[PDB]
Amino acid sequence: MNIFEMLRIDEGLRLKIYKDTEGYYTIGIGHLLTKSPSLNAAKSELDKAIGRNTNGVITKDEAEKLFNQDVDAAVRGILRNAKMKPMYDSMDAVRRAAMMNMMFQMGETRMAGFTNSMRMMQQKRWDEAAVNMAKSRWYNQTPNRAKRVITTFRTGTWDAYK
Template identity: 30%
Template sequence: MNREEVFNQLKEDEGVKYEIYNDHLGLATFGVGHLVIESDSEFGSPLGTSVSEERVWEAFEKDLDTSIDECEVLFGPKWHDFPGEVQEIVVNMMFNMGRPRLSKFKNFCAALEEGDWPKAAVEGRDSRWHKQVTNRAERLMVRLENVS
């Protein structure tokens, strides 16, 4: 899996902001959808506070590691057998939804574990997530269908 490629994809999907802003739930966020948590130096800073590119990348790297770790938990040893392209797609989804939501995609996950990428794409489309983030979801499912 190409981490820089995942970063570029997520920048497109999530956007990137070099300041603290409220996300759609009113929670303090910066960078590539990084939720400000108590252990962050930015915690308690006012909206509009500038965040450096270096700090955005640092937070993204940590969040990406978390998403990858969650994929490893969800799929176990099979995760390492997925082609890089499939890993990038699933990490993108994990970054967006988190493990509690992605783990509810039972048929999607089963198709992935079987290596049936086209079936997984069909299952990914059959979700509320696809309706909520249609452009992102469709782009990811098209990529998944085209994995050889």
Template identity: 30%
Template sequence: MSKIIPIIAYEEGYKEHAYIDTEGYPTIGCGIVIGPKNAPLENYIFNVPRNVGEVWMQKIIDQKIAEINSQPSLRAALNKCNQARADVLYSMAYQLGVSGLCAFKNMLVMISEGNFDGAADAMLNSRWAKQTPARARRHAQVMRTGTYQCYQGVI
């Protein structure tokens, strides 16, 4: 059973009110961008309760999954993944966008070949891993092991 919502909630955190993310975008919930870069927060005076945010996240994930399945390289990788590994790809697509996930060409080839250790190494040897090192280490561990073990007690 997928654990994507609790994984994203853990990785992104949750804020019911708007905030500016690390890239300068107004954001709410679990990293949901709600406006253009550098837009003032006073334009976003609403709150999103967590249960509503989780439904919103699931709708975003459903859209990302449809986009992933429309990309041959992503679909080929996903076909080799168990649920835990698939959740890593979904989480990366949530964070980076599907086009950002597509940029991990070596990782995707390795996953398609069933080389999960190599895929994990490729994940850790990326700009993404330098920007979000703890998240990248956890995701790489899931990719390597095919389990949610590194999230025990969190999800």
């Protein structure tokens, strides 16, 4: 298992533009197009993303290409954050995948809301950090997914995924 397989499981694969749990236009493997409530805006974003005129439908290879870009983007962002970088560098590979999962799904800003949790892990306060992470909008909105990610971060294993 790896970050790719992990997110593929959590994010699923859609080849046509759809509105997510929050109502925002998305496509492929969890690729947020826009927060605009306007579908054509969303189509415009999609064409820009893929580099051709698509009318809301892409191929799986296109989808995977956007996903790799998105995964890269996520790590790049953790590594560029002054506070996250050392946190990530200090983690083992499974736990680093957990963090990548979180970044990818919610973005930098929201991710910063979890700093207390992260310090708690730095300090080997693993269960405490886990219970703490469940106290959040994230968990409240997509509990099964968050539970998997939390378990992953807490244990360093891929148990929640097999």
